[PDB]
Amino acid sequence: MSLENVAFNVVNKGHFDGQQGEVPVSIINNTVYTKVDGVDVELFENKTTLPVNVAFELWAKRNIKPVPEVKILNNLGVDIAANTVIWDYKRDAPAHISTIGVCSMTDIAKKPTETICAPLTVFFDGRVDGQVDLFRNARNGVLITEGSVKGLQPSVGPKQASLNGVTLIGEAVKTQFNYYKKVDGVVQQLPETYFTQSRNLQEFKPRSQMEIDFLELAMDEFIERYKLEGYAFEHIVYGDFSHSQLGGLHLLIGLAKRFKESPFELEDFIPMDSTVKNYFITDAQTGSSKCVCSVIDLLLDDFVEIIKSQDLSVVSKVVKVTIDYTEISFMLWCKDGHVETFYPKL
Amino acid sequence: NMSLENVAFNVVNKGHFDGQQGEVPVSIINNTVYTKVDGVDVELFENKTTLPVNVAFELWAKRNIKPVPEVKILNNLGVDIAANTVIWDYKRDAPAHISTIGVCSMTDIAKKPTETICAPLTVFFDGRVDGQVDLFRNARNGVLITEGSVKGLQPSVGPKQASLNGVTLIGEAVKTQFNYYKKVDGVVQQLPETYFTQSRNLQEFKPRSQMEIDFLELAMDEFIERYKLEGYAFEHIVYGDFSHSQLGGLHLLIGLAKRFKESPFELEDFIPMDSTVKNYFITDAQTGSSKCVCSVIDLLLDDFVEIIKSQDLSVVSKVVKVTIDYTEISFMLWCKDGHVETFYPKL
């Protein structure tokens, strides 16, 4: 089990597949090379804070099956995975500091049954054999599975998962998992939650008739359809570009609509996967800009159900919503019975 | 009360340095600044400058985030340094000027623009900032931009566009066209009348006049016939000649924009910096026509038409100076038999 053996697997199998054999490796700067037909060819560039040869081995041993997005694992408090590596493609780095029975340099244990693992929240995969029963034995852990497990009440997860860095709703493969959580040896009854859609501006696809209507109808016609007058969707979702300080624009679907009409620039000054993102946005057409614009990608149907169930009387209040298995705080301003603004917080 | 962990706190919370109090844990590895979020390192900044990583990180965090003049304009007006701000050169991914004033203990030659070391340096003043207006009139060398009029100073209207967080744009919700005032050796100078480059690119090129709309839509012959351009080698200078191994002409960006919709090509920017004239190693994919140094300037097509129609065709070779972006750009004017052979700008 060597660096030369890990590079052999990457070359011949695209990742670490347990096949033995070795190829020559040159390590220069943060880059792993190998000679192919007399010349050097880059196999990996380290963009982690780990040693180059260690990050390289973790990347080769990344889980290449559909796995939960990193933000779901973080919201559930996961500290470490059991016998695999979750590659965080947002940061091009391992999702967790340590490993369990993966790499001799990062292993704090070889099996999740060891003492150092008991206080940590360990992620278990029900597709790996025996890991289901290991989750019950674990004191603090989180489990996914593709089918019901006897003795546990599932909590249905998102439709999307991550497959080699591609977030997708699987058709040829299952990507919706049942979730289970234990804390201090006590099983948790996970709260019913809204899920974020994990979409982007370029390839945005609507996922309900209301989202289709939002992309097709005019602003005042859509607000008339779903009777959102006084809920300030014009500000919150569509965004106001009239002043130098950009207003609202907190729903990704609204960002996608604007981007389709006119380009803008988004600075992700904290590049990582989280339920709420904060962007520094500069609108190229108008020049309207905002240093911190919080954006969340809820299904528009879910966002409507959330804002329609609020108290329009209090001028300022903080509201918590269970999204992606965590409590997201929203700042709700009001004035004379109508919504001023409504945005999430990271 | 200035430090590395404080700069990173402002970056994480306010998107940039806002003067807030606070600290976050930072680890410096290679040329990259990281910070910890839920137990894992997240990259905040990758140093692409020739300055030390923690220094450039701080200067980037303190960049001006209002609409500011493009670096090429400040270079052409002789600016050596800015007053109490950092103009981030997004073309080079590095600060625009070597030193700073009242910004960073590492790079500060002075803490206020009134110090003696600044007198021989042309200092940039932003009239939108309070007191910066008064600091210009008692500065020896300087350049001032403002929005309104300055009492007793005649304004030179600058370009329509400015740069905002690296995005060049003609502002609508914010003003990006400034008045320009320059002072040399303590005495106010009369800025010459000047053309301005349009500061566009190929991917999102849009015409800004009727003639430019006709250029993109009409055929080469039809355009030359309508605007009476016979004898000015527009087929060569603007449209470009792709018939030979050496590519001919193609010195106007709109010529590249028109060709780009028909066929892709490669533009190597071997001197990646902001300037009024850009040199490119161009390789056209359709024909294989290429040229090592192909100088390109983005002028409004009507402006280029006016410039070349005012020239004299009698001399076989000639160098013509034209004030563009407040600087004297040289043009070579090859002529033969009373018609323009070519007309290319020099970098």
Place this chain on the structure above:
Amino acid sequence: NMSLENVAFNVVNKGHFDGQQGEVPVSIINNTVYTKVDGVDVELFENKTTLPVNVAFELWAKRNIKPVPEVKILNNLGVDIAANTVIWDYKRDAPAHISTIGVCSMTDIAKKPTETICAPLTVFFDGRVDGQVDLFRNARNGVLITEGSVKGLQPSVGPKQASLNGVTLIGEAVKTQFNYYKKVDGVVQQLPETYFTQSRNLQEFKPRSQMEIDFLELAMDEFIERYKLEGYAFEHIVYGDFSHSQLGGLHLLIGLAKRFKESPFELEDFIPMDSTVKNYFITDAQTGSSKCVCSVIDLLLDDFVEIIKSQDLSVVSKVVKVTIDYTEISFMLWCKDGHVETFYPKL
């Protein structure tokens, strides 16, 4: 008279090394070359090679700026080194060969290709440069390209496309189709008749034969009946099977281009280099079907059908060898009941 500051002078003024005289100030930090332009540092080159930064910089500046054979062609033909030039591998962003001849004092193993150390090595000769044709006569091992006839040597027509500054193109204002010649231990070897890959990509894919046009517009079932491909597993090999967790087939680039036209997918090039056969880690965004190693070749679909129709369908597993890009590409052929199960190349 070779100087680092002189190489940088040529890059700034001529876009590449053109033998001009002069120098400019140069900084070297990390694996990056900078130069001072009007007071500030400007990046000229970022070293991605395993060579010293100043050395790699000099080889990049002295790269061949004429249409040259693609690196996959030179590799298949056994080329070990070029004569008095640098073939830049833009797929690797590095020199294509380990050593040089009469190019750079730090990598040169000889100043002329006639020296003793070069005799056991296959030297690439460019017939367009004067004297290189006769150098090919005096060399034991070598590969010569010309755009014309050489007296007494049978020509082998090469691919229509060459590489010009990293752009793979079929030339119209310059010629990219060369006559190839080869020598081994002094004897002029007859090159084999070969197919050539088309060297296209997904984003800019354009059909090149009437059959390839019919592949893109017409439905899957209509195309197979129109060209009598029944039993040849075109449903699997060219179109792809995304119903299963493991992706099936999809070994023709034109098949990926048709899928990419309607639905995005992921292509990890875990061995980034130029070759006739590429291996990709493919992940389909719509279905989630994925394959760790998917061998893909861009043959003209007409060439692919005549290759697959000619093989016999009796044996359950047969390793067919076909000559593509002057090399023995091995194909794995699975058969059952007189029809094709799958047919894929190997790297």
Place this chain on the structure above:
Amino acid sequence: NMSLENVAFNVVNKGHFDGQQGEVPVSIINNTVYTKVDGVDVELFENKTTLPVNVAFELWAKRNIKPVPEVKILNNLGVDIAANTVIWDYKRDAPAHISTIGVCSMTDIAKKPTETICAPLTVFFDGRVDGQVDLFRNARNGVLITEGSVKGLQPSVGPKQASLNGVTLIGEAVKTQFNYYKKVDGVVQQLPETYFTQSRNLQEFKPRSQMEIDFLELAMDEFIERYKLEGYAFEHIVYGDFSHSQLGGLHLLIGLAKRFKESPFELEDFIPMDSTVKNYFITDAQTGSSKCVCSVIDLLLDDFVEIIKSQDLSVVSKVVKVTIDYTEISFMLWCKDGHVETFYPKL
């Protein structure tokens, strides 16, 4: 109120981190911390650790500057971490332990030793610091040193020497011999009686008993005759055999010290860390006798004499455990014909 510019201020003014307020300008390049003095950069710290430069810089500045136990003693007592201080490992030029407590936001697993994450870790407590005494008696796993006696706890007297700013010394103006108390799983443990290594080196080796004075001055035969060491292979184990190509014995530092005054030799420390037993690749200059792995322990010669005289000569080969520096060191005892063949410690 913690930052990089503040750490550097304390380093420049107080020689180390003293908790003073202030800031100095810092630039980070490579693995080195610099600061400006009269316009030029001066190196404050060169990161030799595997931690980020600014992190190790801060941990170094916060190193304990009082006499502290040598790292090898803490390793042998099972210490995983220290409480509210940094034990700098001057042998490795890096922190002795992975994590910290109440020291540095980057490396802190906790801010006080009473947090839950510390319970399974053996924490080091310095009784010379106020309250650290009370923090030991309510800690699950821990190791405590103090100067006086602890009421109701029986003390285990430790070595005479401690380390002070990287200098191992037997203190005269300051006390360096400590009482040692260890607690495992909440219950106090009885530390075994133990020998202690002398922690000397060759350059400044001084004898610490009469027998060691006789060893350095007397001839090999005269010493063995006076202290009645026939049969214990002192010629081999201690004096060393340089007659063969493979060097024999030489497992006692005083043997190397005596040989060093007669003739120089090379000691390659291929595992450069502090430990009770050191392995060296030794090459003797006079004879050319060498050995790849030569284990060396610096025991008081009287202690080694006592150890080997208590053994049983009847068994041909035997592994003997000896408590040195609070750990069980294994020895191989080869015997033949009733006399010791050799006796070497194992690392």
Place this chain on the structure above:
Amino acid sequence: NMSLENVAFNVVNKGHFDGQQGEVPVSIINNTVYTKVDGVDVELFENKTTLPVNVAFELWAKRNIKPVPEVKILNNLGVDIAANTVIWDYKRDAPAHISTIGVCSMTDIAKKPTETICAPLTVFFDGRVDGQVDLFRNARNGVLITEGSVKGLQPSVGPKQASLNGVTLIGEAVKTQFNYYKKVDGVVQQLPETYFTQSRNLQEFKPRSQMEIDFLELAMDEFIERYKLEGYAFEHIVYGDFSHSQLGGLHLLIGLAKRFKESPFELEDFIPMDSTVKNYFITDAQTGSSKCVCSVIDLLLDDFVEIIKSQDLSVVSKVVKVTIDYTEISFMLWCKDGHVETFYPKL
């Protein structure tokens, strides 16, 4: 079965690569190799070569741990590569040769010295390793060393000293004086009769002949009269002239050793490598006399006097050639009036 973690396992347990099985965790940061020892990182190797860090680490671990010829000897004898071993250049802290044979898959040009690529290269053969003697018979070009007779080949006695793990020594428990043999294109060449340098240093200089003893104790004037060196400029060439701003003479190491015995001086080795003649930038601390290039050779003073007495004193300037360490060392000889002005070697 070559593994990076396996090479590190051998370094930790065997002090070098000894073919043992096993692995240890390894970190690679900067040009440094670390390993985890009981929770913390320990440095095992710091790369000073121009080779990749993991590659240089593997060559260092596989270095020859037997007495080998000094690098200056192997260089003078034209050695280009070693057979199935690594000669480590401790003067450069790098491999002595560019490539390897059957040592490391990343630097190997062949697995056996008999392959075609090695025929034009001079391969170093160690007669102590079984089979290497006959490999020297089958090789076109090579250099063989033995500590015994080989049937049918005239031996050439080599220097008394060899290198053992960077220590240059005359062996007593092992033999460092070898018989040398050489082949060129298949024929066994007769090696020339030669002097050998003594390879001593200033700090550990010890005389090796009665004349050299008399050089150290006796005064300058007594020594010259005792050995009839009048008119041979021993006052200048060996003792040195420090009265002038430009230092004079001092080309014999024994002369520097005598000066260093009484007064320190500075020796800048601006070309740090092993060679028969060294060039130093010398600065005397007492007088301030200095020389930019001072060529120094450590010949036995007896060998130097018989070289200088034999040359004729008629010609004003003559370039004498003398065979030292199997190479043609060129000496510059200045004469006047039948006496020596100066006499110095060149590099």
